[PDB]
Amino acid sequence: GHMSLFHLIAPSGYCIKQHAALRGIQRLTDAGHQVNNVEVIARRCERFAGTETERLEDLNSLARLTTPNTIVLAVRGGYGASRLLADIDWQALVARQQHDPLLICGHSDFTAIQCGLLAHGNVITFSGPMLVANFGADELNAFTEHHFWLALRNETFTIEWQGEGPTCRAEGTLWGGNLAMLISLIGTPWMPKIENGILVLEDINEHPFRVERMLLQLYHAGILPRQKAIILGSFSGSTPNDYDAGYNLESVYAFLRSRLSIPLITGLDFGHEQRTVTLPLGAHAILNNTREGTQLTISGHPVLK
Amino acid sequence: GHMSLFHLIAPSGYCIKQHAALRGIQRLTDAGHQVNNVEVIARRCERFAGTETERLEDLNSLARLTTPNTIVLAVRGGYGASRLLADIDWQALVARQQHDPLLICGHSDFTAIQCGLLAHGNVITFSGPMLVANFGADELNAFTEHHFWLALRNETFTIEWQGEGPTCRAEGTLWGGNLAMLISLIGTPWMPKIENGILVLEDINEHPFRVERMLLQLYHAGILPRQKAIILGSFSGSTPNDYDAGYNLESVYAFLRSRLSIPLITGLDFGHEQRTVTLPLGAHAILNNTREGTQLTISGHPVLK
Ligand SMILES: [Mg+2]
Ligand SMILES: [Mg+2]
């Protein structure tokens, strides 16, 4: 059916949840997949998944990786990608992806690498599950599993959900990912300058006020109002404390909405929850929000042949 | 001696520590100071110190505030200044500060307003103590008290400390403040574009990896290497967790140092600890680090006559 090759990379934090990574590896292999580069799991340097040299070579070595239909799977997030950005051989990776592209998938910290690929070569990659959090969870979430294989196997596919926002249609380049990581790139060479897009954002363990602060920066930098639509994903561990006294994500949505002339849709399952979709960053998307529900139709990404 | 007028403003979070604000007011008044605009203490709207309208007018009303030698004192930080930035009458405030300037002092969230004043009119303001955290603490810290009145009363003054870094001399415009707030302005109209400066940074309850992430953005955006020197202040609530496995502020300093050709000095008491200096943002500074210690000589700011 869809037995595949996965190739691990670990540009970010040390894998503390050794149990969960080996559980993810075993689950993939029990399903008939094969996993290369399993040695990245053991690697450690302080809080990083190996030395600057080793994490860097995980990425730069992808230019020589030639097996057909290889899924490159980030192990986990944390911190560490930001240290690598200046030393990544962006041209060589962009060149590699022009023919028989690797199918590169991860989320969180990995956003920054995905962003730099976009900035340098419009190279499409997948914001979606990673080895430890998703494949290595106690149960593999079926929604996430479905949506991963849905994107990677179908040249055109549709996601749907009961989103909140105006009834609207919008079309443009799908981009975004982890909000904090996108913010961390403003002003740098790896910030994608995508206008007229569909920008999708999520985050984890950011209090609402921080989420607002970040969205407002994207607003004030002129990024939000240049898009066709904004979609908000999951904002995990973002419940009010006492001091908030009614201030919550709803307030954040209201505050940004009062400044935007373009639609903002919320409620997509995307980011760090056990339910996440897989979004090909740099692909084409058509957003349609009606009274019956929301759809996002995506095309242009590379798929398993 | 130096009995003065203070005028409160509250652009940020609701004052939950009512006890501490009234304690700060009482301490100032027991010393012979007078405090106006004491009604801002009661104000509340969700997590903010009043409605958008009310917090905004705290700032815009400063243009009509004409008493000689008025110290405008921010009550507290939190979140809220970012919501105001687009609606502040920057020109009117810049114009006000051209003659008989208000002496405006605060830290934390207030950084963003201080930044916008710099960006629009090179208007000097003071990164230093606020009503609740500093004047309203159980004891008024003598180091902080001394350094506050030191800056406000002396046209030229010198701070000294046992800083760590290369032996060096550097000269240029003093700028910076709260690191997270400075980051939140990158790409926006309120980011100061100060080259050849002395950039001083601090923060609170940011883990080291976040501190690094922010410093690296300032590095990758081209801001750090355009300065003459970088000074790091207090980084409060920034001790490692278990996962860090040796990763700490020292690592952060090392990592940035390996990328910078300009000196980076650490160890200044500046920011959120009970000991903080008061730095006039936009003033002229001469940094001198020798084997005996570090000095920073500052001039050009407005003072009490
Ligand atoms: Mg709107
Ligand atoms: Mg250096």
XYZ file of C-alpha atoms and ligand atoms in Angstrom:
612
model
C 0.000 0.000 0.000
C 2.238 2.861 1.226
C 5.289 1.298 2.828
C 7.973 3.950 2.816
C 11.463 5.037 3.751
C 11.900 7.563 6.572
C 15.225 9.306 7.197
C 15.600 10.942 10.605
C 17.089 14.322 11.256
C 17.662 15.993 14.639
C 18.542 19.685 14.348
C 16.996 20.712 17.669
C 16.809 19.438 21.224
C 18.227 16.282 22.740
C 15.767 13.373 22.785
C 15.098 12.923 26.532
C 12.061 10.663 25.802
C 14.210 7.828 24.532
C 11.332 5.399 25.183
C 9.020 7.449 22.886
C 11.432 7.814 19.993
C 12.110 4.015 19.995
C 8.398 3.492 20.283
C 7.886 5.686 17.183
C 10.631 3.828 15.267
C 9.034 0.483 16.223
C 5.563 1.599 15.179
C 6.800 2.774 11.768
C 8.747 -0.445 11.248
C 5.818 -2.651 12.472
C 3.734 -0.945 9.786
C 6.388 -1.923 7.125
C 8.246 1.308 6.882
C 11.976 1.431 7.065
C 13.888 4.068 9.074
C 17.342 5.341 8.355
C 19.663 7.484 10.473
C 18.382 5.972 13.711
C 21.736 6.952 15.362
C 20.582 10.554 15.650
C 18.383 9.430 18.650
C 21.369 8.756 20.928
C 23.140 12.030 20.177
C 23.578 14.661 22.892
C 25.400 17.935 23.491
C 24.066 19.886 26.504
C 20.377 20.543 25.572
C 20.998 19.857 21.794
C 20.761 16.702 19.719
C 24.550 16.673 19.158
C 27.236 19.215 18.469
C 26.770 22.188 16.116
C 28.778 20.163 13.577
C 26.704 17.023 13.832
C 23.247 18.822 13.728
C 24.409 20.944 10.870
C 25.497 17.832 8.872
C 22.125 16.212 9.390
C 20.791 19.015 7.189
C 23.646 19.600 4.761
C 23.861 15.809 4.068
C 20.371 15.861 2.640
C 21.799 17.208 -0.569
C 23.400 13.740 -1.166
C 20.393 11.731 -0.123
C 19.098 10.089 -3.352
C 16.735 7.251 -2.519
C 13.351 7.683 -4.304
C 10.431 8.851 -2.256
C 12.353 9.511 0.982
C 10.396 11.073 3.853
C 12.832 13.168 5.999
C 11.291 13.286 9.463
C 12.394 15.715 12.161
C 12.730 13.807 15.559
C 11.655 16.714 17.762
C 11.658 20.431 18.462
C 12.950 22.495 21.406
C 15.793 24.831 20.516
C 18.735 24.506 18.186
C 17.671 25.206 14.631
C 18.339 28.949 15.120
C 22.046 28.199 15.770
C 22.345 26.463 12.400
C 20.707 28.903 10.039
C 23.838 30.872 9.017
C 25.823 27.683 8.212
C 23.186 25.662 6.286
C 24.108 25.172 2.551
C 20.896 26.704 1.407
C 21.775 26.675 -2.299
C 22.794 23.000 -2.285
C 19.524 22.057 -0.486
C 17.436 24.197 -2.825
C 19.211 22.547 -5.806
C 18.553 19.075 -4.370
C 14.809 19.797 -4.102
C 14.457 20.845 -7.769
C 14.420 17.196 -8.924
C 12.910 14.144 -7.158
C 12.501 16.211 -3.961
C 12.807 14.804 -0.499
C 9.522 14.958 1.442
C 10.587 16.862 4.554
C 8.255 17.015 7.497
C 8.423 18.459 11.046
C 6.981 21.265 13.195
C 7.919 23.595 16.064
C 11.535 24.602 16.084
C 11.908 23.085 12.621
C 9.738 25.955 11.329
C 12.835 28.066 11.090
C 14.585 25.689 8.624
C 11.327 25.380 6.635
C 11.201 29.147 6.540
C 14.751 29.481 5.289
C 13.982 26.935 2.526
C 11.084 29.091 1.482
C 13.047 32.331 1.580
C 15.957 30.967 -0.523
C 14.189 28.742 -3.081
C 10.423 28.567 -2.528
C 11.053 24.990 -1.451
C 7.979 23.246 -0.170
C 8.125 21.263 3.028
C 5.579 19.848 5.400
C 4.511 21.341 8.724
C 3.305 18.289 10.420
C 4.144 15.372 12.763
C 7.506 14.462 14.192
C 8.898 11.198 15.442
C 8.647 11.652 19.187
C 5.558 13.722 19.815
C 3.355 12.142 17.134
C 4.604 8.680 15.948
C 5.997 7.897 19.394
C 2.985 8.884 21.485
C 1.292 6.152 23.631
C -1.309 5.863 20.860
C -0.780 7.097 17.336
C -3.572 9.621 16.798
C -5.672 8.482 13.800
C -6.661 11.999 12.742
C -2.971 13.031 12.539
C -1.954 9.775 10.799
C -4.700 10.172 8.259
C -3.802 13.769 7.471
C -0.090 13.061 7.163
C -0.575 10.327 4.483
C -3.372 12.381 2.956
C -0.932 15.234 2.136
C 2.031 13.094 1.129
C 0.048 10.795 -1.203
C -2.351 13.260 -2.927
C -1.332 15.998 -5.361
C -4.498 17.838 -4.513
C -6.235 17.370 -1.166
C -8.810 19.049 1.027
C -8.897 19.612 4.750
C -12.118 20.489 6.438
C -13.174 21.692 9.818
C -15.798 23.760 11.513
C -13.796 27.042 11.482
C -15.015 30.373 12.941
C -14.813 33.511 10.835
C -16.387 35.284 8.005
C -17.858 33.408 5.004
C -15.193 33.935 2.406
C -13.017 32.550 -0.327
C -9.241 33.270 -0.505
C -6.436 31.872 -2.644
C -2.626 32.142 -2.405
C 0.627 30.527 -1.170
C 0.180 28.554 2.054
C 2.829 29.506 4.653
C 3.520 29.814 8.421
C 3.922 27.287 11.179
C 5.053 27.909 14.770
C 4.339 31.504 15.669
C 7.300 32.077 18.004
C 9.700 30.663 15.405
C 8.223 32.895 12.644
C 8.613 35.937 14.913
C 12.260 34.953 15.621
C 13.069 35.373 11.870
C 11.668 38.882 11.315
C 14.454 41.070 9.957
C 16.671 38.067 9.083
C 17.558 36.462 5.761
C 15.267 33.442 6.445
C 11.981 35.318 6.790
C 9.753 34.391 3.796
C 8.452 37.537 2.027
C 5.240 35.944 0.781
C 2.499 38.353 -0.145
C -1.078 37.517 -0.869
C -0.783 34.274 1.037
C -2.759 32.094 3.365
C -0.706 32.366 6.591
C -1.398 29.640 9.214
C -0.122 29.990 12.724
C 0.028 27.908 15.952
C 1.971 27.756 19.128
C 2.416 26.040 22.455
C 2.816 27.203 26.061
C 2.566 30.878 25.070
C 0.120 32.775 27.280
C -2.521 34.760 25.289
C -0.837 38.070 25.886
C 2.360 36.705 24.299
C 0.324 35.336 21.414
C -1.159 38.815 20.951
C 2.182 40.432 21.206
C 3.461 38.255 18.443
C 0.423 38.680 16.197
C 0.640 42.410 16.673
C 4.234 42.399 15.594
C 3.298 40.557 12.428
C 0.527 43.151 12.030
C 2.791 46.218 12.661
C 5.630 44.813 10.484
C 3.062 44.852 7.537
C 3.103 41.072 7.198
C -0.502 40.246 8.182
C -2.240 42.844 6.038
C -0.287 41.747 2.952
C -1.909 38.286 3.075
C -5.289 37.117 1.686
C -6.236 35.300 4.859
C -4.995 34.323 8.286
C -5.736 30.976 9.849
C -5.211 30.208 13.449
C -4.407 26.717 14.538
C -3.953 25.253 17.961
C -2.699 27.428 20.779
C -1.772 24.811 23.417
C -1.240 25.431 27.166
C -2.774 28.887 26.683
C -5.478 28.976 29.376
C -5.763 32.171 31.536
C -4.237 32.618 34.970
C -6.058 34.593 37.700
C -4.527 38.006 36.830
C -6.038 37.734 33.322
C -9.487 38.507 34.643
C -11.291 37.570 31.398
C -8.360 38.037 29.041
C -8.072 34.920 26.850
C -7.554 33.720 23.284
C -11.000 35.035 22.275
C -9.811 38.480 23.291
C -6.751 38.046 21.204
C -8.791 37.069 18.135
C -11.078 40.106 18.675
C -8.224 42.491 19.064
C -6.517 41.348 15.892
C -9.799 41.142 13.915
C -10.515 44.811 14.748
C -7.291 45.699 12.877
C -7.553 43.381 9.918
C -9.464 43.895 6.663
C -8.862 40.285 5.575
C -10.450 37.263 7.047
C -9.129 35.474 10.095
C -10.375 31.961 10.650
C -9.844 30.038 13.764
C -10.211 26.544 15.063
C -7.960 24.453 12.785
C -6.314 21.439 14.338
C -2.707 22.364 13.594
C 0.409 22.450 15.757
C 1.212 20.658 18.992
C -1.962 18.843 20.026
C -2.342 15.115 19.351
C -4.624 16.150 16.486
C -2.763 18.061 13.845
C -3.063 18.384 10.132
C -0.040 18.414 7.799
C 0.367 21.585 5.763
C 2.760 21.856 2.829
C 4.398 25.238 3.390
C 4.946 26.985 0.027
C 2.112 25.074 -1.721
C -1.016 26.692 -3.209
C -4.127 26.862 -1.029
C -7.817 27.757 -1.565
C -9.677 28.667 1.558
C -13.458 28.464 1.455
C -15.442 29.253 4.588
C -19.221 28.813 4.232
C -22.110 28.434 6.675
C -21.694 24.589 6.445
C -17.914 24.610 7.355
C -14.399 25.463 6.254
C -12.318 23.844 3.622
C -8.738 24.272 2.575
C -7.769 22.789 -0.795
C -4.015 22.454 -1.278
C -1.916 21.587 -4.315
C 1.523 21.955 -5.773
C 3.483 20.025 -3.157
C 5.594 16.957 -3.999
C 4.039 13.566 -3.153
C 5.065 9.924 -2.850
C 4.944 8.340 -6.347
C 17.368 68.993 48.642
C 15.566 67.166 45.794
C 11.869 67.196 46.597
C 10.066 66.635 43.329
C 6.829 66.148 41.453
C 5.995 62.679 40.111
C 3.171 62.125 37.620
C 1.973 58.536 37.275
C 1.176 56.798 34.049
C -0.183 53.262 33.594
C -0.016 52.052 29.987
C 0.409 48.369 30.836
C -1.011 45.834 33.257
C -3.572 46.278 35.997
C -2.045 46.979 39.415
C -2.907 43.797 41.368
C -0.426 44.741 44.164
C -2.560 47.611 45.378
C -0.764 47.477 48.748
C 2.633 47.998 47.012
C 1.594 50.886 44.799
C 0.101 52.753 47.828
C 3.224 51.880 49.732
C 5.322 53.446 46.932
C 3.111 56.570 46.860
C 3.430 56.884 50.662
C 7.199 56.476 50.594
C 7.596 59.175 47.928
C 5.283 61.524 49.811
C 6.969 60.784 53.210
C 10.221 61.848 51.550
C 8.568 65.198 50.489
C 7.729 64.382 46.942
C 4.326 65.034 45.544
C 2.482 62.557 43.284
C -0.078 63.404 40.677
C -2.446 61.151 38.732
C -2.818 58.744 41.644
C -6.218 57.656 40.162
C -4.447 55.517 37.577
C -3.814 52.928 40.404
C -7.493 51.959 40.703
C -8.059 51.542 36.971
C -8.831 48.118 35.501
C -9.934 46.549 32.227
C -9.374 42.763 32.093
C -5.555 42.415 32.539
C -4.899 46.125 31.572
C -4.663 49.280 33.647
C -7.883 50.656 32.096
C -9.468 50.727 28.684
C -7.502 51.309 25.460
C -8.860 54.875 25.580
C -7.809 55.590 29.132
C -4.235 54.067 28.802
C -3.752 55.845 25.541
C -4.728 59.221 27.124
C -2.250 58.723 29.929
C 0.404 59.048 27.222
C -1.153 61.540 24.823
C -1.974 63.895 27.768
C 1.707 64.294 28.490
C 1.897 66.784 25.676
C -0.134 69.233 27.874
C 1.734 68.541 31.068
C 3.696 71.765 31.815
C 4.867 71.778 35.415
C 8.670 72.337 35.644
C 10.830 69.368 36.421
C 8.071 66.725 36.296
C 9.154 63.093 36.673
C 6.662 60.864 34.738
C 6.820 57.467 36.419
C 5.406 54.302 34.875
C 3.425 52.309 37.596
C 4.267 48.852 36.258
C 4.872 46.574 33.299
C 3.113 43.406 32.088
C 1.414 43.779 28.726
C -0.469 46.617 27.115
C 1.947 49.120 25.644
C 2.035 47.167 22.347
C -1.721 47.803 21.874
C -1.167 51.560 22.073
C 1.735 52.116 19.733
C -0.261 52.836 16.536
C -2.499 55.428 18.279
C 0.112 57.388 20.302
C 0.526 61.042 19.072
C 4.194 60.593 18.516
C 4.743 64.005 16.914
C 2.966 65.885 19.716
C 5.044 64.001 22.353
C 8.275 64.569 20.442
C 7.374 68.294 20.168
C 6.641 68.468 23.907
C 10.088 67.044 24.740
C 11.983 69.651 22.672
C 11.591 72.282 25.424
C 11.603 71.785 29.228
C 11.288 68.003 28.721
C 9.427 65.723 31.045
C 11.720 63.218 32.791
C 10.069 59.924 31.860
C 11.138 56.778 33.615
C 10.030 53.106 33.561
C 11.200 49.656 32.424
C 9.851 46.350 31.086
C 6.814 46.717 28.910
C 7.386 50.472 28.860
C 10.478 49.790 26.719
C 8.261 49.763 23.688
C 7.029 53.366 24.231
C 10.619 54.464 24.981
C 11.641 52.820 21.746
C 8.970 54.571 19.725
C 10.079 57.922 21.226
C 13.573 57.179 20.053
C 12.518 56.089 16.580
C 10.340 59.191 15.955
C 12.350 61.990 17.614
C 15.506 60.718 19.330
C 13.717 61.548 22.565
C 15.620 60.517 25.638
C 13.865 58.686 28.423
C 14.972 56.689 31.406
C 15.072 52.904 31.679
C 14.836 52.537 35.347
C 12.551 52.025 38.384
C 8.787 51.982 38.450
C 6.320 52.698 41.198
C 5.289 49.206 42.219
C 8.328 47.016 41.779
C 10.924 49.529 42.997
C 9.426 52.401 45.109
C 6.734 50.105 46.494
C 8.920 47.160 47.475
C 9.034 46.149 51.203
C 12.321 48.064 51.421
C 13.412 50.669 48.922
C 16.712 49.348 47.572
C 19.432 51.959 48.260
C 21.524 51.058 45.214
C 18.509 51.623 42.911
C 17.469 54.826 44.734
C 20.963 56.201 44.495
C 21.273 55.468 40.789
C 17.872 56.913 39.941
C 18.650 60.342 41.529
C 22.206 60.085 40.237
C 20.963 60.072 36.600
C 18.161 62.592 37.013
C 20.264 65.178 38.893
C 23.628 64.998 37.032
C 24.229 66.099 33.443
C 27.204 63.805 33.307
C 27.444 60.727 35.523
C 29.359 57.484 35.785
C 28.214 54.000 36.645
C 30.710 51.403 37.656
C 30.711 47.702 38.195
C 32.942 44.701 37.965
C 31.908 43.713 34.395
C 33.249 40.672 32.482
C 34.560 41.121 28.960
C 37.420 42.397 27.006
C 39.404 45.489 28.100
C 38.067 48.109 25.760
C 36.777 51.593 25.198
C 33.601 52.297 23.142
C 31.525 55.421 22.572
C 28.063 55.977 21.038
C 24.305 56.394 21.682
C 23.078 54.399 24.683
C 19.963 52.345 23.816
C 18.040 49.118 24.628
C 16.090 47.971 27.634
C 13.908 44.857 27.952
C 15.058 42.297 25.430
C 11.670 40.712 24.682
C 10.122 44.146 24.111
C 12.976 45.179 21.750
C 12.504 41.943 19.786
C 8.728 42.621 19.558
C 9.460 45.853 17.579
C 11.739 44.426 14.867
C 10.227 45.256 11.489
C 7.849 47.876 12.963
C 7.884 51.670 12.853
C 9.002 51.909 16.531
C 12.277 50.005 16.230
C 15.161 52.487 16.783
C 17.707 52.294 13.920
C 20.689 53.341 16.023
C 24.057 52.419 14.616
C 27.354 52.590 16.382
C 25.643 52.477 19.743
C 26.074 50.994 23.162
C 23.111 48.566 23.320
C 22.149 47.372 26.847
C 19.803 44.484 27.319
C 18.010 42.674 30.198
C 15.067 40.454 30.742
C 13.058 38.463 33.234
C 11.655 34.922 33.358
C 13.093 34.063 29.930
C 14.935 30.736 29.964
C 18.503 30.946 28.511
C 17.533 29.330 25.256
C 14.910 32.054 24.709
C 17.479 34.687 25.613
C 19.791 33.175 22.990
C 17.059 33.001 20.470
C 16.405 36.661 20.907
C 20.062 37.701 20.853
C 20.557 35.661 17.727
C 17.705 37.428 16.048
C 19.274 40.771 16.861
C 22.520 39.303 15.491
C 20.959 37.903 12.246
C 18.864 41.070 11.657
C 22.262 42.998 11.518
C 21.471 45.003 14.643
C 24.175 43.691 17.012
C 27.125 43.966 14.649
C 26.231 47.573 13.796
C 26.847 48.651 17.413
C 30.131 49.592 19.160
C 29.410 47.456 22.190
C 26.818 45.228 23.790
C 26.142 45.218 27.497
C 24.180 42.581 29.237
C 22.250 43.401 32.339
C 20.256 41.215 34.643
C 18.604 38.096 33.306
C 16.201 37.216 36.156
C 14.501 33.828 36.750
C 16.863 32.331 34.158
C 18.343 29.342 36.015
C 18.555 25.975 34.125
C 16.032 23.166 34.396
C 17.140 19.501 34.319
C 16.867 19.068 30.513
C 19.443 21.866 30.060
C 22.254 19.579 31.113
C 24.844 22.380 31.433
C 23.166 24.882 29.133
C 22.980 28.242 30.943
C 23.532 31.977 30.531
C 27.312 31.455 30.295
C 26.669 29.303 27.251
C 24.566 32.007 25.775
C 27.297 34.620 26.278
C 29.868 32.256 24.682
C 27.704 31.508 21.724
C 27.053 35.153 20.970
C 30.685 36.190 21.644
C 31.879 33.652 19.035
C 29.856 35.613 16.436
C 30.631 39.148 17.486
C 33.658 41.279 16.590
C 32.674 43.984 19.100
C 32.871 43.708 22.803
C 30.156 42.192 24.939
C 30.264 43.008 28.617
C 28.207 41.312 31.181
C 27.255 41.681 34.784
C 25.568 45.109 34.965
C 22.820 45.509 37.513
C 20.051 46.570 35.140
C 16.472 45.389 34.696
C 14.156 43.593 37.090
C 16.223 42.784 40.174
C 15.947 44.958 43.288
C 19.288 46.432 42.216
C 19.012 48.280 38.960
C 20.708 51.266 37.480
C 18.836 53.964 35.532
C 19.945 54.385 31.932
C 18.916 57.348 29.793
C 18.018 55.720 26.479
C 19.152 57.959 23.587
C 21.901 59.670 25.649
C 25.639 59.499 24.867
C 27.693 56.822 26.622
C 31.425 56.025 27.003
C 32.177 52.492 27.996
C 35.579 51.796 29.510
C 36.412 48.279 30.657
C 39.850 47.909 32.285
C 41.479 45.303 34.524
C 40.297 47.330 37.606
C 36.560 47.412 36.535
C 33.987 48.792 34.132
C 32.692 52.273 33.843
C 29.942 53.813 31.802
C 29.949 57.611 31.540
C 26.661 59.048 30.293
C 25.670 62.544 29.206
C 23.183 64.432 27.124
C 20.016 63.501 28.997
C 17.707 66.098 30.577
C 18.016 66.536 34.365
C 16.136 68.154 37.238
C 17.149 71.854 37.415
Mg -11.417 42.468 10.632
Mg 33.646 38.047 19.931
